[PDB]
């Protein structure tokens, strides 16, 4: 079944895979993160309550005073988004934080408080995220791009480089928290284990063991295991564990109970271990050579006097053995060491350790971290504790603690956010085992080691950054001075917090402008996964690993949507279905295969959980019950794919789209293109300028509608109902009954957006698609946005194309365009620029605004009014005055030539100079809007009074329209009340509407529903007047301009740019190219029916760039256009709705095994007519991304029309009429138009304005500047014999200040000589080197 928006034009679908999950709402990331951020979270988990309960309470410097936090609340924005986009201010809301200042009493450590005082204070102003994921910051519209950073917690990287000149690998742990100091444990090439803290110098890692109050016997006891020896008065006997001989060598006879197991020269195999575990021997004998190198475990004092025979971590020598025995010791502990299983790395590092006590370890860390200054007893351990064990300066996360305890295999997933002793000891033991072989290194690019920060996370971090400075200032205010009974309204300065959060949202790395020249460009700007910014790497030191794609990206991050250039694969785009975890790693849905069938329990699997199972593919055929068709089905287990048995699998993919992003889910026949051209197509599809009248994709993808709906560019109905009235700018829906809430009388008013500019200066404009009296439903699209058509994405216009080389005019990537394209105005985009004119308060006096400007004639002053601003609708062009601004000046002291001139003409001098806002050169538009701002107190002129009168009349009419048409709906529902239980069919119509809501009924709810709609209408009666006075004082008030500026006049030109040679166009597959000739209609080749083809394209760009998908896009375009012309022929003559139903149903039947069987017998002969009128330009065809349209279906489509199955017809030539040999491929490629418009690119400067310090020209096209003749071009000129060209180029075209006026006067006096001199930049270099102590002089 279909909605009433789909009975208009139902797009034919070639999807064969039956879909299971819908495409989720594409803007969930930004909206959900900011909803977590600004929310009264009752527990301290998310956003503001978490940040406040983190940093608060602040107490004084033990000054018996503490500032605590109670609760916060957010204000209402004084400006909604439209008024604040006009006004240029942010769209923010203020947080009135309720605080309380407590005062602990004296002689009261935890005694009571003598004085508490609660006071609701203000601080900061958080910009609210609008209903689409954008902010308004200073009039603009910014999108906080989500960041993918490395997950906090332990990270056992290796080295795996040479880095040694021997090739040994050196494993290093690294403990990243969300906030705090780092910690590594790197190995040394001599198998020394070296800690380092925040990448300072390497110190031996047992120092920090001693700093945790560990003696050296405990340091040995953790990391090693015991071999208790034996003295039976001699024989050096040994308590044996048989598995200690794993790979060892017996140079003696290992003999026990007089039984031989291993011998000299026989190495200890596991067979001897089997003999030993058969014999169960505890104590053996080993010779005197055995304990010659064993390192003792504890301090063995003397038996008699307690003198140290041997301290711990000392190798036992034979004289040490004799001294230990003659003292009287019998049992000796030592360490089971080995060069294979238990390397004595802690023992060797303990030897190289120059420390002996805990206090000396603290002193050593103090002389490492904060060097030079000597420590106290206290300051050393205080620094060390505040490093890793303080809730204020160390915090892993909940995420960091989860990744930590999951990386060292703990059962908990939560705990203390700071470290502990066993945490560091476990990281050390795991690193040691990773050295010995057991355990493998991680990788950073794996997306189980990479989070997603978003607007909520980074905004809360900035809020914490503001609050720690407010904590510093509050501790400064509290302990110093007084106690006081002072209130907590002056101890907190609003401007630091506002400064921090505005510095984030205004200009961070990730606070970027919304590239607003599509719907698609808006969505793929919001769904951006960038790895730059704070806490992220830069482009200069981004190695070839994070640029690369991973086997974990599948289903999370698009592999073909990343901008090429310096940041390839750092600005990744999120996949379609790719959700985000609780913690933040990108999880992706999978539907669980049970025993043998694909149950639809759609589970979202994260990255590390994906790495276990065996996930099938979306192209696995299902036998309509759930089982796989084959008995072995391809899949992927752990990165690598395989071919596993069909019972072995554990999950199946959700849909064919889940790897690619939303941008790359719009290219038809994606899988036929190469990955490079698919990348360029995805990158170029989000720069398409929305044209004059956007068409359709005749070859679509089905994600057109979801992308169009799921952006904020269109107007979708919220409650379904009958359309009551549609104007060109407003829509009035009357709500259906059951979907209407009983309080209001529902008439939804959708006011569209008309002809306002984008960020890229295009025309963001909404035109209604519905008609009057049409029933629409919930979620139905009412008004197309920009680049939309009936709620489908239409970025470009589909044109009849042909692939043949035509006379060289389409040589490399150039593109012919027939003149009938520009007659039809298919690509005539509208650009709306904004010009401004501030009227400051200079010290000479105020710059006025009037239309009496000196030294300009009437020819420019015709277009302004008497108030100095131009008329709305005036066709202005290059150089004309928009806003005439006179500026005062003084001390003219004219040169006598101008004195003689003004005396010849009798002209007066002008004390006011002219700084009028004139149009820039080249742009010729139509002035559609003048917005006049005024500082309060300044007098409005006639124009601003006229505009305020107009805006007030518009707002009063707006509130009267809402009250009156709401009154119409109110008395309509009152009449619907008045047709039941006391029905007065004419008596209600007899007395007027004063008493319709006061009419006598029965004792039902409808009697006090007449009074409910009555008090509704009296509420509206007071609301109209109060909101009217609100809007009136909001209009007529002053403005919040900058200091010093009086009035700002914005004038909005609107240019309707055509297309021309120079303009860049592109297909959807990387088939770009600047168009090159506007060929006429006759010269463009025609097929044998008369139709000239519209765009001639070069064939040789196909098989080298391998975007073979566009050949099939062209063929299916020809198929769909053949169907459109067949229906148009059946509609030209009035055939019948019956035969039309027969043909359209036959067109929807083919091909084989597709979903959406659409049965046209349920269409009621008006929607067949209305469907035919929409299909008549071409039946739109959905070809999903990797579900595709197989070519036999295209051949059957081409045989449904009369077209030839090759897709290749006999084009005839244009200028001769001789038929082309070898017949050519014509069809309908959906061509785009990019905004690399040649009028924005073309620029030339003869002589303009030179820069300040060095007299050289300026930058490109905005300051009217010369092209840079960089050093490579200098080498190119030196590589010829060209000396004079190079000399004049860097002397007199550019820099010699006295030289180039002589050059110009030589030119205009007809003599091309040059008197070069010496460039000014070299004099600058002279005075700059010489402004050190360096006498550099030119000598002769």
């Amino acid at each position: 079944v279909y909605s009433y928006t789909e009975k208009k034009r139902i797009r034919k679908d070639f999807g064969k895979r039956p879909q299971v999950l819908d495409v989720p709402y594409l803007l969930s990331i930004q909206l959900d993160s900011f909803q977590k951020f600004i929310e009264q979270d009752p527990e301290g988990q998310y956003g503001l309550e978490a940040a406040f309960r983190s940093v608060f309470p602040i107490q004084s410097y033990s000054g018996n005073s503490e500032l605590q936090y109670v609760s916060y609340r957010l204000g209402e924005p004084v400006f909604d988004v439209q008024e604040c986009q006009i006004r240029g201010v942010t769209y923010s809301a203020p947080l009135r934080v309720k605080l309380r200042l407590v005062i602990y009493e004296r002689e009261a450590p935890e005694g009571t408080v003598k004085d508490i005082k609660e006071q609701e204070v203000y601080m900061g102003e958080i910009p609210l995220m609008t209903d689409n994921g954008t902010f308004v910051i200073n009039g603009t519209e910014r999108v906080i791009v989500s960041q993918l950073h490395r997950s906090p917690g332990v990270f056992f990287d290796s080295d795996k480089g040479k880095t040694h000149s021997s090739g040994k690998v050196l494993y290093n742990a690294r403990i990243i928290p969300y906030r705090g100091s780092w910690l590594d444990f790197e190995f040394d090439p001599k198998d020394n284990l070296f800690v380092r803290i925040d990448r300072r110098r390497k110190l031996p890692a047992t120092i920090i063991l001693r700093a945790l109050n560990y003696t050296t016997e405990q340091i040995l006891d953790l990391f090693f295991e015991k071999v208790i020896f034996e003295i039976r008065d001699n024989k050096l006997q040994m308590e044996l564990v048989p598995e200690r001989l794993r790979g060892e060598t017996a140079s003696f006879d290992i003999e026990a109970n007089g039984k031989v197991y291993v011998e000299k020269g026989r190495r200890i195999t596991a067979r001897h271990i089997r003999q030993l575990e058969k014999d169960d021997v505890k104590l053996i004998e080993v010779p005197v050579e055995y304990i010659a190198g064993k390192v003792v475990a504890k301090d063995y004092i003397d038996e008699s006097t307690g003198e140290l025979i041997c301290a711990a971590n000392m190798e036992l020598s034979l004289d040490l053995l004799a001294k230990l025995s003659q003292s009287g010791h019998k049992r000796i502990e030592t360490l089971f060491t080995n060069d294979l299983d238990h390397g004595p790395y802690i023992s060797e590092t303990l030897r190289v350790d120059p420390t002996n006590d805990r206090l000396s370890a603290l002193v050593e860390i103090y002389r490492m971290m904060r060097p030079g200054e000597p420590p106290t007893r206290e300051a050393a351990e205080s620094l060390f504790e505040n490093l890793f064990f303080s809730e204020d300066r160390y915090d892993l996360s909940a995420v960091g603690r989860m990744k930590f305890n999951r990386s060292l295999l703990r059962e908990e997933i939560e705990g203390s956010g700071i470290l502990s002793k066993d945490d560091i000891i476990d990281v050390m033991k795991k690193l040691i085992d990773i050295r010995n072989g057991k355990g493998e290194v991680d990788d950073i690019d794996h997306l189980g080691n990479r989070r997603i920060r978003s607007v909520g996370e980074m905004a809360e971090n900035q809020f914490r950054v503001g609050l720690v400075r407010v904590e510093r200032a509050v501790k400064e205010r509290l302990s110093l001075g007084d106690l006081d009974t002072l209130m907590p309204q002056d101890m907190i300065n609003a401007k630091p917090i506002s400064a921090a959060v505005k510095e984030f949202f205004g200009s961070s790395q990730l606070s970027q402008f919304m590239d607003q020249n599509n719907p698609l460009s808006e969505i793929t700007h919001k769904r951006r996964i960038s790895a730059l910014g704070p806490g992220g790497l830069t482009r200069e030191r981004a190695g070839f690993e994070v640029r690369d794609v991973h086997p974990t990206h599948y289903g999370r991050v698009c592999p073909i949507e990343t901008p090429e250039g310096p940041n390839i694969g750092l600005i990744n785009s999120l996949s379609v279905y790719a959700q985000t975890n609780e913690y933040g790693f990108l999880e992706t849905p999978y539907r669980k295969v049970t025993d043998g069938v694909v149950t639809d329990e759609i589970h979202y699997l994260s990255a590390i959980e994906e790495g276990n199972y065996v996930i099938a593919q979306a192209n696995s055929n299902l036998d309509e019950e759930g089982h796989f068709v084959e008995d072995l089905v391809t899949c992927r287990s752990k990165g690598e794919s395989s071919l596993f048995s069909r019972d072995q699998v554990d999950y199946m993919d959700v849909s064919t789209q889940q790897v690619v992003s939303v941008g790359a889910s719009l290219i038809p026949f994606l899988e036929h293109d190469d990955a490079n051209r698919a990348l360029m197509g995805a990158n170029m599809q989000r720069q398409a300028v929305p044209t004059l009248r956007a068409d359709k994709p005749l070859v679509g993808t089905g994600m057109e509608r979801a992308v169009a709906v799921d952006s904020g560019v269109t107007a979708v109905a919220k409650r379904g109902g009958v359309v009551q009235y549609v104007d060109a700018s407003r829509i009035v829906i009357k709500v259906n009954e059951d979907e209407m809430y009983p309080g209001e009388a529902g008439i939804d008013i959708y006011n569209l957006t008309k002809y306002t500019r984008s960020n890229q200066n295009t025309c963001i404009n909404q035109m209604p698609c519905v008609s009057l009296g049409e029933p629409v439903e919930r979620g139905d699209v009412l008004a197309d946005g920009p680049s939309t058509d009936l709620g489908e994405l239409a970025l470009g216009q589909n044109m009849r194309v042909a692939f043949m080389p035509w006379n060289g005019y389409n040589f490399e990537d150039s593109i012919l365009v027939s003149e009938r394209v520009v007659q039809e105005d298919r690509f005539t985009t509208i650009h709306i620029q904004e010009l401004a004119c501030v009227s400051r308060d200079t010290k000479l006096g105020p710059e006025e605004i009037t239309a009496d400007i000196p030294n300009v004639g009437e020819a420019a002053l015709s277009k302004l009014d008497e108030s100095g601003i131009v008329y709305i609708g005036a066709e202005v062009t290059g150089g004309d005055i928009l806003v005439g601004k006179v500026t005062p000046k003084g001390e003219t002291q004219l040169t006598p030539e101008e004195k003689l001139l003004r005396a010849i003409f009798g002209e007066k001098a002008s004390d006011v100079k002219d700084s009028s806002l004139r149009v820039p050169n080249g742009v010729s538009g139509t002035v559609i809007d003048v917005q006049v701002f005024t500082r309060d107190g300044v007098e409005k002129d006639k124009r601003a009074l006229e505009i305020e009168e107009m805006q007030l009349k518009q707002a009063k009419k707006d509130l009267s329209e809402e009250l009156q048409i709401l009154e119409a709906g109110l008395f309509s529902r009152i009449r619907a009340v008045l047709v039941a239980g006391g029905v007065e069919a004419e008596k209600l119509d007899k007395l007027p509407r004063d008493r319709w809501l006061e009419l006598g009924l029965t004792d039902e709810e409808k009697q006090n529903q007449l009074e409910q709609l009555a008090e509704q209408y009296d509420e509206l009666k007071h609301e109209f007047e109060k909101k009217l006075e609100a809007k009136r004082r909001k209009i007529t008030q002053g403005d919040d301009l900058a200091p010093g500026v009086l009035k700002i006049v914005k004038v909005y030109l609107a240019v309707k740019r055509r297309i021309q040679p120079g303009d860049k166009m592109a297909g959807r597959h990387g088939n770009k190219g600047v168009i090159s000739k506007i060929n006429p209609i006759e010269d463009m080749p025609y097929d044998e029916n008369g139709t000239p083809v519209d765009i001639v394209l070069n064939p040789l760009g196909v098989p080298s760039r391998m975007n073979i998908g566009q050949i099939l896009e062209t063929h299916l375009g020809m198929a769909a256009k053949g169907i459109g012309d067949k229906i148009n022929a059946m509609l030209k003559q009035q055939q019948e709705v019956a035969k039309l139903r027969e043909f359209i149903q036959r067109a929807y039947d083919l091909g084989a095994d597709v979903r959406q069987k659409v049965d046209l017998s349920t269409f009621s002969d008006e929607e067949v007519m209305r469907l035919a009128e929409n299909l008549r330009k071409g039946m739109p065809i959905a070809t999903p991304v990797f579900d595709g349209a197989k070519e036999a279906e295209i051949k059957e489509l081409l045989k449904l029309g009369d077209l030839p199955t090759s897709g290749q017809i006999r084009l005839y030539d244009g200028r001769t009429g001789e038929q082309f040999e070898r017949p050519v491929t014509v069809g309908y490629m959906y061509m785009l138009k990019l905004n690399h418009l040649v009028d924005d690119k073309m620029h030339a400067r003869s002589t303009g304005s030179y820069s300040l310090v060095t007299q050289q020209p300026l930058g490109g096209k905005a300051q009217f500047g010369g092209q840079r003749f960089g050093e490579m071009e200098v080498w190119a000129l030196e590589a010829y014999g060209a000396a004079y060209t190079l000399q004049e180029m860097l002397t007199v075209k550019s820099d010699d200040v006295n030289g180039r006026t002589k050059m110009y006067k030589n030119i205009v006096d007809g003599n091309h000589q040059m008197e070069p001199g010496m460039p000014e930049s070299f004099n600058v270099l002279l005075k700059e080197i010489r402004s050190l102590g360096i006498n550099i002089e030119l000598e002769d």
Partner: protein
């Protein structure tokens, strides 16, 4: 071997003097104020830690820390210069005024690149304190009109004093985030004419001289000394009356005649008032 930065060396150095008791301070000042330099050296050398303590609070203004410390040192030297032990007071109370005020005047002087005077900076700090207290009453940024309301001062005065709080930007900072474009690439040398206006002036000068020699001699000498043009000085009609032609009215007459001839000569070349003045 100390690590050789200036702050650590100084802060380690200043502890090498025992802090003085009250009778000790009074005796040292008694010796100091009669001209014994060792007593001055002991009094200033001991209370350096007071200067670091006082100037600790004035951190994170425009001046760096050691600048604040060294400027407090000057006031401390002023304080021992004018301390009185005869009031019996502890020295810290009297020196606190001098050190606090001579760091306050330091921040008022050496912060802004365009040096505002003292009273302008105190007047601006009055308004900023008023705005900080006014922001908690209306929970938005108080306007220039709002501060002018709360202090009942004229709105133009508060607007001027807030515009004198401009926070003068750098030039060398890049624009647009990307480090390719600072203000040197944006700013244009506005006083220096390019070659176009510089050749228009020279061509206009030669054209003026040519047209003047196209005019007869008695007219052009009046019009030359009248404007100082043809190698002359710009003289008065009374002056060239006594110098060349005794009737000042006839000098005005020949000036109007020469101006009419030059009007004809200019308009023969098509240069009218619309041509030269748009």
């Amino acid at each position: 071997q100390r690590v050789l930065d200036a702050t650590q060396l100084y802060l380690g150095e200043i502890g090498y003097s025992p802090l003085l008791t009250a009778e000790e301070e009074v005796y040292f000042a008694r010796r100091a104020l009669r001209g014994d330099v060792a007593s001055r050296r002991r009094m200033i050398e001991s209370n350096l830690r007071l200067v670091v303590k006082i100037a600790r609070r004035y951190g994170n203004r425009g001046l760096a820390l050691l600048d604040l410390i060294e400027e407090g040192n000057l006031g401390l030297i002023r304080a021992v210069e004018k301390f009185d032990p005869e009031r019996g007071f502890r020295f810290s109370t009297y020196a606190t005024w001098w050190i606090r005020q001579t760091i306050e005047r330091a921040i008022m002087n050496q912060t802004r690149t365009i040096r505002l005077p003292i009273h302008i900076v105190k007047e601006l700090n009055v308004y900023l304190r008023t705005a900080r207290e006014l922001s908690h009453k209306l929970d938005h940024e108080p306007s220039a009109e709002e501060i002018a309301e709360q202090l009942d001062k004229p709105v133009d005065d508060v607007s001027r004093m807030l515009r004198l709080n401009e926070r003068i930007t750098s030039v060398d900072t890049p624009l647009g985030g990307d480090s390719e474009k600072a203000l040197l690439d944006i700013l244009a040398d506005e006083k220096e004419n390019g070659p176009e206006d510089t050749t228009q002036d020279d061509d206009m000068k030669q054209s003026i001289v040519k047209w003047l020699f196209e005019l007869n001699a008695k007219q052009r000498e009046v019009l030359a000394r009248r404007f100082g043009l043809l190698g002359y000085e710009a003289a008065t009609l009374e002056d060239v009356g006594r110098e060349i032609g005794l009737t000042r009215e006839r000098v005005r007459q020949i000036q109007v005649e020469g101006l009419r001839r030059l009007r004809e000569i200019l308009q023969t070349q098509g240069l009218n008032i619309e041509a030269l003045f748009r």
